[PDB]
Amino acid sequence: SDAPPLTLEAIKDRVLYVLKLYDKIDPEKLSVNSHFMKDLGLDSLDQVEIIMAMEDEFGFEIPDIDAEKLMCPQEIVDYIADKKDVYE
Amino acid sequence: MNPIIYTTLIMTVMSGTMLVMISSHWLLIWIGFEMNLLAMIPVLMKNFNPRATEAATKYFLTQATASMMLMMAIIINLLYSGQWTITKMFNPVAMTMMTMALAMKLGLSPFHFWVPEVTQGISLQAGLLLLTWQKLAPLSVLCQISQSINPNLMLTMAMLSILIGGWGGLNQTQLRKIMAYSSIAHMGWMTAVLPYNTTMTILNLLIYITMTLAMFMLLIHSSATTTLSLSHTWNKMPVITSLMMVTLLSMGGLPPLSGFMPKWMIIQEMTKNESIIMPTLMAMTALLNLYFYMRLAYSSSLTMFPSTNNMKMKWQFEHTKQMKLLPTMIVLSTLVLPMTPALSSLN
Amino acid sequence: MPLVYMNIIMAFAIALAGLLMYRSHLMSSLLCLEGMMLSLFIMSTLIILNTHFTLANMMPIILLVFAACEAALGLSLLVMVSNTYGTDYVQNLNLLQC
Amino acid sequence: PTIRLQEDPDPEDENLYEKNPDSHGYDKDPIVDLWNMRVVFFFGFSIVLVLGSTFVAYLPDYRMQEWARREAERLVKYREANGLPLMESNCFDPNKIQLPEDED
Amino acid sequence: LQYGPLAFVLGERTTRKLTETSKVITVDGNICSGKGRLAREIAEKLGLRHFPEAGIHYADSTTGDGKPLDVQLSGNCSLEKFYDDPKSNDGNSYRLQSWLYASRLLQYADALEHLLSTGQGVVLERSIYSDFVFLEAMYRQGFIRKQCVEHYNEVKKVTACEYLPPHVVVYVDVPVPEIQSRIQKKGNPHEMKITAAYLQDIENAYKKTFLPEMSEKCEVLQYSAREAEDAEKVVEDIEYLKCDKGPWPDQDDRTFHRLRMLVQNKLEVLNYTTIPVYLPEITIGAHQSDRVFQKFTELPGRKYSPGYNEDVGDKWIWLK
Amino acid sequence: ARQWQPDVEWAEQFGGAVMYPTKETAHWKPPPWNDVDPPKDTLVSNLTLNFGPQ
Amino acid sequence: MLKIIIPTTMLLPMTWMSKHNMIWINATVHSLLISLISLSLLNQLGENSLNFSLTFFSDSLSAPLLVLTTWLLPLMLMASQSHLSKETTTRKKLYITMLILLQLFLIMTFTATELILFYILFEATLVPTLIIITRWGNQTERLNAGLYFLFYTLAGSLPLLVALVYIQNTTGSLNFLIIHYWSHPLSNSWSNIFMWLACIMAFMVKMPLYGLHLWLPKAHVEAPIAGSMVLAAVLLKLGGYGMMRITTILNPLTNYMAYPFLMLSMWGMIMTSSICLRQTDLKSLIAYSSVSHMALVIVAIMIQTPWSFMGATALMIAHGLTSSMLFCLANTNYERVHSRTMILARGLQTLLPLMATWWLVASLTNLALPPSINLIGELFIITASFSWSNITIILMGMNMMITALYSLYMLITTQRGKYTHHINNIKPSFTRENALMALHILPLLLLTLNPKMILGPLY
Amino acid sequence: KFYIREPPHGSPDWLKVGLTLGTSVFLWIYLIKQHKEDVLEYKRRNGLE
Ligand SMILES: CCCCCCCCCCCCCCCCCC(=O)OC[C@H](COP(=O)([O-])OCC(O)COP(=O)([O-])OC[C@@H](COC(=O)CCCCCCCCCCCCCCCCC)OC(=O)CCCCCCCCCCCCCCCCC)OC(=O)CCCCCCCCCCCCCCCCC
Ligand SMILES: CCCCCCCCCCCCCCCCC[C@@H](O)O[C@H](CO[C@H](O)CCCCCCCCCCCCCCC)COP(=O)(O)OCC[N+](C)(C)C
Ligand SMILES: CCCCCCCCCCCCCCCCC[C@@H](O)O[C@H](CO[C@H](O)CCCCCCCCCCCCCCC)COP(=O)(O)OCC[N+](C)(C)C
Ligand SMILES: CCCCCCCC/C=C\CCCCCCCC(=O)O[C@H](COC(=O)CCCCCCC/C=C/CCCCCCCC)COP(=O)(O)OCCN
Ligand SMILES: CCCCCCCCCCCC(=O)SCCNC(=O)CCNC(=O)[C@H](O)C(C)(C)COP(=O)(O)O
Ligand SMILES: Nc1ncnc2c1ncn2[C@@H]1O[C@H](COP(=O)(O)OP(=O)(O)O)[C@@H](O)[C@H]1O
């Protein structure tokens, strides 16, 4: 059979694993609702690298638009849920 | 492909089969098989459509492997006796190799895997030729060497073919795979009686060929290769579906239809040789074939499936090219049981 | 049977085994088909020479001829498959199931 | 359209009495229906039921019941006068029977 | 001797019939443009057989007697009621579109058969290649569902791939307000209910998609309303085209034999129009199918094959 | 008051690749309407060569 | 014997060359005349059979079966022409062709001299029956029913074929006269035990025997009216006739191989008779009463006595007539209210007085009221069973008590009480339905005056 | 009538009809002659006549 029925909890776990895998972010400091620019003091270029890491993690192309707004982990989870049609 | 090229390839296929059928030298029989395969490959690829390329490659690999084992058996037999004539096969290892090569060529279980794939991947005309003409040469060879054939191996493959054809047909919605599994089961029936009586093998082959020709021509007439596509035919040509239902019932082996004659004639023969368990298992297993024929009959003729609006346009046109031998084939595949004793003319 | 006959028969068995156990490349299997033909040629030539069957001396040559027709056939198919996939891997021949 | 196809509504059944108040229930056409009634009644009740029953009642005694009664009367008369037993325990004569050699 | 493999083996080829006048020409354009008169005049000047635009009862005209059949036995759709109620919940819109695509496919096969059997060129109004501009406008206005568009694309994919596209694509460009005024002037009460957005979508499909991919296989001749009436200029413009871009010069006698064997035998042409995809707009239940088919068979010339109907004056039947 | 004939929900049982769908087999898809699969546009790479300077 | 076969075969071209509005008249008249011709076979001998030719013969066991078979066709045609009104002409002719082919196969089946020919015809009767059920049945279950009908029968009869061609290979013939004269005892061995089972299970499934009777409540319920009429009246009796014919070769093996079947029959009689007490479907109740009645025929054939064989013949004929009448009576109500639920339409005696009389007479014959031949056959079988073992009277007695209970219950639910208020489409009975009931019931009562005509070769 | 003149119509293809009837009668004549010859030869061989 094909891939399992991915859920929101899996998306959040993978996204937070990716963020804690980033060197410029101290792991235990980041939260699900922490704004990338304000909370972690991350510049615009840093956000681009994180979005590309998401594209590698979940295997789908996130355009330049719709990536300019994913500014905290929760928005990333919502975007992936919308793109993959996951509700529960 | 050019029509002249198609005609000459068909003549080469038939010429290879006849070369196998008239030869007394093993090398000429091998050459006939090679010549048959060489011209057979382009007929399977007549419409390009990469599934046909896949089917042709699988068929070529299977038949080339079988040809190599056949040649090796011929050479072993020659080594143990300086004989080239097709006879009772003086060596038993050579006999086992020859039986396995011929079982691969016919598609008997467990060498049966290629038949459903190749049949599904080619067109209906190619499937007709593959499931009717291609069986003549290997069975004609097996009839000749039947006396030296080991019953335990041949009957094991026959029972396996009947079981596997019956089980495989149950899961199929595509008509060509259904035909392939039906072919595997009927091959098993043919080869079960071969060590006892080759006239029964010939009779079963002839009845199976007429039934298969009728079924394939009825599927060509109504351009249907799936169950749902065939379920539209009642709303365009009801007569075709009625004749298809009767032919399916005959293929099932139900009396008083033509399909019943071979099984009836094989079971009886096996009872004269003190074989009771084997015919009982074969007859009970053939009910799987009957089941998946009955399911198709339910889909196409005994109930009416929903149709489409554009079918209305098809009501205004007639089938242009007619198959002249279809009526004779239908009558021969259904109403021939009262002339069973004429089978004595086959020996 | 002398040791040479068993060596030739073992060569045929190894080639048949090689043909049966597929790896990835289609051409690797066509080579095993060619090897089976070569083993048959050597075996039949040895048997024919040993028993001094003069007429049979033409049959290995015939055996060679239909070896080419089978190889040329196979290579032809290998072209079409490659033209569909850009690769001769047998994994790609999975459009039709059982 | 929340319907899965275009289909006729299920039609309501036809009462044969609406157009033919003396309808006999055989056919919509009054003349054909009346002749269906007449032909069923005549060939079922007048021909098969009456004439067939009469034919079966007067069938000849091919079962030989009266014959058997006459033969039985003859043998009872003959045996009683003779003083012989009315019926015999063994149907087949002992003289024509060859039993095995000895009882052991 | 009907054409077939035996006639091809003994002689007959189609490349010898072509005389540089074959030129399958289609004359497209929006609704109520002048493309009909332009097409008739082009066919008159060039000595080409003209084909009036294939409508709902096109198939009726080529079979039996050319008289149209009842809408129940032929078409089962209404253009008038598509204008009256485009969003009707009985599926009339996509049923009309799919039936019209089938009729255009049959007309294209008839035109190709005529050209390949006689060598004389044919002029068509629209074709299967421009039919989709009516589908897209239907979908953008919310008249049909996305499943209908997917079914249309499936049927087009397995049908339009078996034919040669036209040599010459003539387009008549008339702006939306002018065709609107022409519609208001014509007098048809149903046709005045065409919204401007519908016609704008038809034009958008024609210009954004149809013409660009038509122009990459052959030259496209676009014209305005006033210069479209000048037919001799268009004819001599066609006379000086350099057709080296399409697959038509890349056709052999064997490909032409395959194409001709396909364009006769209309049953094979229409094979994939009735694929078992069950959309509500086009699926008809078993009871209605049976009733309507029995009604069709009771028609005066339809119970038997064309030469075998004693009730339309056929004779010597017992000896055919 | 009408004989029951199959509808779309009945007919769809036979539209699948296999009669009995299985966890693994439910991902099999029916063959195309014509036996023609979408052309696998495989990128056959062109060899790149340096002609010169030396 | 061709003087019956050939006229039956001529019913096919006559039906196909008839006018669109004359098929029913022609078919009914000529099938009635064929019944009249068939009545001549009742002239039977006391010692041997009527050996017409090498192929066909008639006995005192097959003659009443033939007469019932030919008599049933006109009744089926009368019962079918109402619900097939809206049908097209060609499909009406196809339905009549199915019925004619069924009659032809049954007529040859009951008179075949050789057991393989008997087997071929007895299996050929499956095709028209299955086509009738699965093409003209009303509901979606009719497909499944067909499968149940097809595979229960064949799974039983496929071994029988293997047995038969085995027997001919050892005794030399399958001719029934030769089989009877050259009879030999069956030894007590495993091979003979399985040969006994192969010769018997095919017929047991047709009866059917309690345990393998599941196909019947499906097939009879889902079938159209003529299908259920022929299934109950004639097709069930094929098993009884075949068992009676094949028992000669079986002895003395039958004395101990009959115990499981006697237990199954004597208990399933009670089981199915009690099942009839809680049955919401009227046609299903009628179907289950048939299993309860055929258990008795199985017992009579297994115990192998002249009184039991006479009783089994009489009961087979009487059950054929009564079950056909009951199925027709239920169909009359079904064509009004279009539901087979027994409690949906009540108090019908108020609205349909004469059809209520028909219901009463059918129920009376179903519970074997003396001196009906139902009672004659039942009482003969009960007496023979008492001779076989006295304790049987307990089981037999219990069955009689239960049979009367569900019969009159069936009568009280549908005819008495008060009519349901909402139903208002209950039209007066047609002459066709009344005549169809009369042509069922009058021969039944007339057979009381000459019971020797239906008592078989042991009389 | 018809739109396309439907070339096979009220005047049947008389060549094909003639060929069909000629083949049927030729086969019948040959079969009767063959049966007569077979009977004569059978009686000649068996010493009957
Ligand atoms: C025990 C006793 C009983 C024994 C039983 C024996 C077995 C019984 C039968 C077994 C099963 C048979 C199955 C047949 C499958 C055939 C497949 C097929 O053709 O497609 C189906 C076909 C599908 O049609 P379609 O798809 O609608 O048509 C579209 C076209 O395919 C679209 O294609 P196209 O556009 O390309 O159209 C071209 C078309 C149109 O045709 C043309 O235009 C003709 C052109 C002429 C070109 C000339 C070229 C000449 C140059 C080539 C020379 C080659 C030499 C080769 C020899 C080399 C030797 C070394 O040509 C064809 O369609 C096919 C042509 C067939 C040619 C036949 C060649 C015969 C060769 C004989 C070999 C043996 C010779 C002796 C050898 C001795 C040993 C060495 O329709 C059918 O065939 C229906 C079934 C027909 C079966 C017939 C029934 C069985 C036989 C009954 C008659 C009596 C038989 C017993 C005789 C007893 C002895 C007297
Ligand atoms: C509506 C109002 C109802 C009441 C008013 C009615 C008035 C009274 C009418 C009823 C009459 C009462 C019957 C009284 C008995 C007298 C009749 C009796 O004498 O006839 C019997 C004769 O009956 C016949 O034998 C039975 C007829 C056979 C029935 C066959 C039915 C027709 C075929 C239909 C097909 C059905 C299929 C059947 C499958 C087997 C006697 O048999 P048997 O002892 O010898 O005769 C001795 C003299 N013989 C021998 C010289 C003749
Ligand atoms: C639900 C409806 C189904 C249909 C019902 C069909 C019923 C079929 C039952 C067959 C009746 C008897 C069969 C064989 C006769 C005796 C069987 C055995 O139990 O008795 C002993 C047999 O001995 C042993 O018990 C061997 C049998 C044990 C192995 C068989 C397993 C039986 C279990 C029940 C299976 C369920 C049957 C139905 C399957 C679906 C007798 O002792 P013995 O003196 O030694 O043998 C004498 C027999 N000889 C003469 C042939 C030699
Ligand atoms: C609707 C369900 C009905 C089920 C009916 C199925 C049961 C049928 C009874 C068994 C069928 C096979 C019997 C074979 C035919 C008998 C012919 C015969 O006599 O052959 C025997 C051989 O008998 C057998 O081999 C039969 C063995 C069983 C083989 C198949 C097994 C089938 C299952 C057996 C148990 C099931 C039967 C009862 C089930 C009742 C239905 C539930 C002896 O011959 P010889 O070999 O020559 O011996 C003398 C010289 N040596
Ligand atoms: C293998 C190694 C070899 C190296 C390869 C050589 C690569 C050469 C590429 C040179 C191209 C350029 O400079 S491209 C020109 C880049 N300059 C600008 O865009 C001016 C405005 N500055 C800003 O927008 C922000 O400072 C910014 C930091 C950009 C982030 O922006 P955010 O506020 O949105 O995070
Ligand atoms: N493929 C189509 N789909 C939907 N409607 C169509 C189609 N083709 C033509 N029509 C309608 O048929 C009518 C006539 O077509 P049009 O080309 O616009 O005018 P004319 O051909 O008479 O000059 C118009 O109402 C048009 O909308």
PDB file of N, CA, C and O in Angstrom, chain D residues 13 15 17 24-26 32 36 39-41 45 48-49 52-53 60 62-63, chain G residues 21 29 32 39 43-45 60 71 78 81 338 427-432 442 452:
ATOM      1  N   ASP D  13     -49.454   0.742 -12.019  1.00  0.00           N
ATOM      2  CA  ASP D  13     -50.023  -0.407 -12.701  1.00  0.00           C
ATOM      3  C   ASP D  13     -51.373  -0.070 -13.326  1.00  0.00           C
ATOM      4  O   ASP D  13     -52.123   0.783 -12.847  1.00  0.00           O
ATOM      5  N   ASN D  15     -55.176  -0.902 -14.466  1.00  0.00           N
ATOM      6  CA  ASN D  15     -56.362  -1.677 -14.123  1.00  0.00           C
ATOM      7  C   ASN D  15     -57.080  -2.047 -15.414  1.00  0.00           C
ATOM      8  O   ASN D  15     -57.538  -1.170 -16.150  1.00  0.00           O
ATOM      9  N   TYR D  17     -59.920  -3.206 -15.697  1.00  0.00           N
ATOM     10  CA  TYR D  17     -61.344  -2.927 -15.596  1.00  0.00           C
ATOM     11  C   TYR D  17     -61.700  -1.496 -15.979  1.00  0.00           C
ATOM     12  O   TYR D  17     -62.878  -1.208 -16.199  1.00  0.00           O
ATOM     13  N   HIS D  24     -62.125 -10.062 -17.855  1.00  0.00           N
ATOM     14  CA  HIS D  24     -61.661 -11.451 -17.854  1.00  0.00           C
ATOM     15  C   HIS D  24     -60.179 -11.585 -17.501  1.00  0.00           C
ATOM     16  O   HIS D  24     -59.700 -12.691 -17.246  1.00  0.00           O
ATOM     17  N   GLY D  25     -59.453 -10.472 -17.465  1.00  0.00           N
ATOM     18  CA  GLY D  25     -58.054 -10.469 -17.077  1.00  0.00           C
ATOM     19  C   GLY D  25     -57.107 -11.263 -17.948  1.00  0.00           C
ATOM     20  O   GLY D  25     -56.082 -11.730 -17.451  1.00  0.00           O
ATOM     21  N   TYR D  26     -57.398 -11.417 -19.239  1.00  0.00           N
ATOM     22  CA  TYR D  26     -56.477 -12.122 -20.124  1.00  0.00           C
ATOM     23  C   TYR D  26     -55.655 -11.180 -20.995  1.00  0.00           C
ATOM     24  O   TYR D  26     -54.467 -11.425 -21.213  1.00  0.00           O
ATOM     25  N   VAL D  32     -59.537 -10.234 -28.180  1.00  0.00           N
ATOM     26  CA  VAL D  32     -58.503 -11.228 -27.921  1.00  0.00           C
ATOM     27  C   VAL D  32     -58.645 -11.786 -26.513  1.00  0.00           C
ATOM     28  O   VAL D  32     -58.489 -12.990 -26.288  1.00  0.00           O
ATOM     29  N   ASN D  36     -59.358 -15.629 -25.559  1.00  0.00           N
ATOM     30  CA  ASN D  36     -58.474 -16.335 -24.642  1.00  0.00           C
ATOM     31  C   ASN D  36     -59.270 -17.020 -23.540  1.00  0.00           C
ATOM     32  O   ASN D  36     -59.008 -18.184 -23.207  1.00  0.00           O
ATOM     33  N   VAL D  39     -61.236 -20.043 -25.112  1.00  0.00           N
ATOM     34  CA  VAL D  39     -60.369 -21.147 -25.484  1.00  0.00           C
ATOM     35  C   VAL D  39     -59.790 -21.851 -24.259  1.00  0.00           C
ATOM     36  O   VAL D  39     -59.742 -23.090 -24.238  1.00  0.00           O
ATOM     37  N   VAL D  40     -59.416 -21.108 -23.212  1.00  0.00           N
ATOM     38  CA  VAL D  40     -58.955 -21.752 -21.989  1.00  0.00           C
ATOM     39  C   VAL D  40     -60.067 -22.581 -21.371  1.00  0.00           C
ATOM     40  O   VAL D  40     -59.857 -23.744 -21.015  1.00  0.00           O
ATOM     41  N   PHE D  41     -61.270 -22.016 -21.255  1.00  0.00           N
ATOM     42  CA  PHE D  41     -62.359 -22.748 -20.617  1.00  0.00           C
ATOM     43  C   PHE D  41     -62.734 -23.993 -21.407  1.00  0.00           C
ATOM     44  O   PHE D  41     -62.899 -25.069 -20.824  1.00  0.00           O
ATOM     45  N   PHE D  45     -61.646 -27.255 -19.364  1.00  0.00           N
ATOM     46  CA  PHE D  45     -62.743 -27.845 -18.610  1.00  0.00           C
ATOM     47  C   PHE D  45     -63.575 -28.810 -19.439  1.00  0.00           C
ATOM     48  O   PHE D  45     -64.037 -29.827 -18.917  1.00  0.00           O
ATOM     49  N   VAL D  48     -60.004 -31.576 -21.723  1.00  0.00           N
ATOM     50  CA  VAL D  48     -59.062 -32.355 -20.928  1.00  0.00           C
ATOM     51  C   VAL D  48     -59.704 -32.836 -19.632  1.00  0.00           C
ATOM     52  O   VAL D  48     -59.523 -33.989 -19.229  1.00  0.00           O
ATOM     53  N   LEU D  49     -60.466 -31.972 -18.963  1.00  0.00           N
ATOM     54  CA  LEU D  49     -60.978 -32.319 -17.642  1.00  0.00           C
ATOM     55  C   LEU D  49     -62.086 -33.361 -17.720  1.00  0.00           C
ATOM     56  O   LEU D  49     -62.094 -34.321 -16.945  1.00  0.00           O
ATOM     57  N   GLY D  52     -60.895 -36.331 -20.732  1.00  0.00           N
ATOM     58  CA  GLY D  52     -59.742 -37.043 -20.207  1.00  0.00           C
ATOM     59  C   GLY D  52     -60.073 -37.886 -18.991  1.00  0.00           C
ATOM     60  O   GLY D  52     -59.603 -39.020 -18.863  1.00  0.00           O
ATOM     61  N   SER D  53     -60.882 -37.344 -18.077  1.00  0.00           N
ATOM     62  CA  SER D  53     -61.302 -38.114 -16.911  1.00  0.00           C
ATOM     63  C   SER D  53     -62.130 -39.321 -17.322  1.00  0.00           C
ATOM     64  O   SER D  53     -61.964 -40.413 -16.767  1.00  0.00           O
ATOM     65  N   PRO D  60     -58.840 -49.999 -20.177  1.00  0.00           N
ATOM     66  CA  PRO D  60     -58.910 -51.458 -20.069  1.00  0.00           C
ATOM     67  C   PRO D  60     -57.969 -52.001 -19.006  1.00  0.00           C
ATOM     68  O   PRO D  60     -56.947 -51.399 -18.673  1.00  0.00           O
ATOM     69  N   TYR D  62     -55.366 -53.609 -18.217  1.00  0.00           N
ATOM     70  CA  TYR D  62     -54.041 -54.105 -18.565  1.00  0.00           C
ATOM     71  C   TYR D  62     -53.211 -54.453 -17.339  1.00  0.00           C
ATOM     72  O   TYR D  62     -52.161 -55.087 -17.478  1.00  0.00           O
ATOM     73  N   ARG D  63     -53.653 -54.047 -16.147  1.00  0.00           N
ATOM     74  CA  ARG D  63     -52.987 -54.439 -14.915  1.00  0.00           C
ATOM     75  C   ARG D  63     -53.351 -55.852 -14.484  1.00  0.00           C
ATOM     76  O   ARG D  63     -52.734 -56.371 -13.550  1.00  0.00           O
TER      77      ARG D  63
ATOM     78  N   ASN G  21     -50.189 -10.768 -30.753  1.00  0.00           N
ATOM     79  CA  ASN G  21     -51.272 -10.860 -29.788  1.00  0.00           C
ATOM     80  C   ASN G  21     -51.929 -12.234 -29.758  1.00  0.00           C
ATOM     81  O   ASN G  21     -53.040 -12.363 -29.239  1.00  0.00           O
ATOM     82  N   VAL G  29     -53.548 -23.469 -25.917  1.00  0.00           N
ATOM     83  CA  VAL G  29     -54.374 -24.494 -26.551  1.00  0.00           C
ATOM     84  C   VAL G  29     -53.543 -25.725 -26.870  1.00  0.00           C
ATOM     85  O   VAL G  29     -53.941 -26.864 -26.583  1.00  0.00           O
ATOM     86  N   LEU G  32     -52.382 -27.702 -23.829  1.00  0.00           N
ATOM     87  CA  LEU G  32     -53.495 -28.492 -23.312  1.00  0.00           C
ATOM     88  C   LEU G  32     -53.738 -29.741 -24.151  1.00  0.00           C
ATOM     89  O   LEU G  32     -53.977 -30.824 -23.600  1.00  0.00           O
ATOM     90  N   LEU G  39     -52.215 -38.185 -21.534  1.00  0.00           N
ATOM     91  CA  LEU G  39     -53.063 -39.034 -20.697  1.00  0.00           C
ATOM     92  C   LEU G  39     -53.063 -40.500 -21.125  1.00  0.00           C
ATOM     93  O   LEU G  39     -53.418 -41.362 -20.317  1.00  0.00           O
ATOM     94  N   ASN G  43     -52.214 -45.902 -19.159  1.00  0.00           N
ATOM     95  CA  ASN G  43     -52.532 -47.307 -19.358  1.00  0.00           C
ATOM     96  C   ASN G  43     -51.277 -48.143 -19.175  1.00  0.00           C
ATOM     97  O   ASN G  43     -50.524 -48.369 -20.126  1.00  0.00           O
ATOM     98  N   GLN G  44     -51.040 -48.594 -17.952  1.00  0.00           N
ATOM     99  CA  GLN G  44     -49.816 -49.282 -17.587  1.00  0.00           C
ATOM    100  C   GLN G  44     -50.083 -50.761 -17.361  1.00  0.00           C
ATOM    101  O   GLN G  44     -51.213 -51.181 -17.107  1.00  0.00           O
ATOM    102  N   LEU G  45     -49.019 -51.545 -17.456  1.00  0.00           N
ATOM    103  CA  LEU G  45     -49.076 -52.977 -17.219  1.00  0.00           C
ATOM    104  C   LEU G  45     -48.795 -53.282 -15.754  1.00  0.00           C
ATOM    105  O   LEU G  45     -48.356 -52.427 -14.984  1.00  0.00           O
ATOM    106  N   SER G  60     -45.048 -47.202 -14.461  1.00  0.00           N
ATOM    107  CA  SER G  60     -46.093 -46.664 -13.605  1.00  0.00           C
ATOM    108  C   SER G  60     -45.575 -45.593 -12.655  1.00  0.00           C
ATOM    109  O   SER G  60     -46.380 -44.933 -11.995  1.00  0.00           O
ATOM    110  N   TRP G  71     -49.353 -31.183 -17.893  1.00  0.00           N
ATOM    111  CA  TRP G  71     -50.467 -30.395 -17.394  1.00  0.00           C
ATOM    112  C   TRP G  71     -50.019 -29.062 -16.816  1.00  0.00           C
ATOM    113  O   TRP G  71     -50.796 -28.103 -16.827  1.00  0.00           O
ATOM    114  N   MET G  78     -50.881 -19.465 -18.308  1.00  0.00           N
ATOM    115  CA  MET G  78     -51.960 -18.637 -17.780  1.00  0.00           C
ATOM    116  C   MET G  78     -51.470 -17.739 -16.653  1.00  0.00           C
ATOM    117  O   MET G  78     -51.870 -16.573 -16.563  1.00  0.00           O
ATOM    118  N   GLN G  81     -48.981 -14.620 -18.182  1.00  0.00           N
ATOM    119  CA  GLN G  81     -49.355 -13.604 -19.159  1.00  0.00           C
ATOM    120  C   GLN G  81     -49.851 -12.307 -18.529  1.00  0.00           C
ATOM    121  O   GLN G  81     -50.053 -11.331 -19.257  1.00  0.00           O
ATOM    122  N   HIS G 338     -48.108  -5.773  -4.158  1.00  0.00           N
ATOM    123  CA  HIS G 338     -46.685  -5.664  -4.492  1.00  0.00           C
ATOM    124  C   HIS G 338     -45.796  -5.801  -3.262  1.00  0.00           C
ATOM    125  O   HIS G 338     -44.809  -5.084  -3.101  1.00  0.00           O
ATOM    126  N   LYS G 427     -58.683  -5.056  -6.454  1.00  0.00           N
ATOM    127  CA  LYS G 427     -59.685  -5.242  -7.485  1.00  0.00           C
ATOM    128  C   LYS G 427     -60.310  -6.627  -7.389  1.00  0.00           C
ATOM    129  O   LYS G 427     -59.723  -7.544  -6.815  1.00  0.00           O
ATOM    130  N   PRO G 428     -61.517  -6.799  -7.925  1.00  0.00           N
ATOM    131  CA  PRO G 428     -62.139  -8.126  -7.927  1.00  0.00           C
ATOM    132  C   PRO G 428     -61.321  -9.127  -8.727  1.00  0.00           C
ATOM    133  O   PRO G 428     -60.589  -8.777  -9.653  1.00  0.00           O
ATOM    134  N   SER G 429     -61.453 -10.393  -8.347  1.00  0.00           N
ATOM    135  CA  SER G 429     -60.712 -11.463  -8.999  1.00  0.00           C
ATOM    136  C   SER G 429     -61.060 -11.547 -10.478  1.00  0.00           C
ATOM    137  O   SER G 429     -62.216 -11.380 -10.872  1.00  0.00           O
ATOM    138  N   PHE G 430     -60.049 -11.800 -11.298  1.00  0.00           N
ATOM    139  CA  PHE G 430     -60.256 -12.012 -12.719  1.00  0.00           C
ATOM    140  C   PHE G 430     -60.653 -13.455 -12.985  1.00  0.00           C
ATOM    141  O   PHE G 430     -60.390 -14.357 -12.188  1.00  0.00           O
ATOM    142  N   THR G 431     -61.295 -13.669 -14.132  1.00  0.00           N
ATOM    143  CA  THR G 431     -61.638 -15.025 -14.542  1.00  0.00           C
ATOM    144  C   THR G 431     -60.390 -15.869 -14.764  1.00  0.00           C
ATOM    145  O   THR G 431     -60.407 -17.079 -14.519  1.00  0.00           O
ATOM    146  N   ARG G 432     -59.302 -15.247 -15.217  1.00  0.00           N
ATOM    147  CA  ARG G 432     -58.065 -15.979 -15.450  1.00  0.00           C
ATOM    148  C   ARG G 432     -57.536 -16.598 -14.160  1.00  0.00           C
ATOM    149  O   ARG G 432     -57.166 -17.777 -14.134  1.00  0.00           O
ATOM    150  N   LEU G 442     -59.245 -29.119  -9.227  1.00  0.00           N
ATOM    151  CA  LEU G 442     -60.156 -30.165  -9.679  1.00  0.00           C
ATOM    152  C   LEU G 442     -59.450 -31.489  -9.972  1.00  0.00           C
ATOM    153  O   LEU G 442     -59.956 -32.541  -9.567  1.00  0.00           O
ATOM    154  N   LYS G 452     -55.060 -45.573  -7.710  1.00  0.00           N
ATOM    155  CA  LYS G 452     -54.093 -46.505  -8.280  1.00  0.00           C
ATOM    156  C   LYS G 452     -53.332 -45.901  -9.451  1.00  0.00           C
ATOM    157  O   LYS G 452     -52.257 -46.398  -9.797  1.00  0.00           O
TER     158      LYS G 452
END
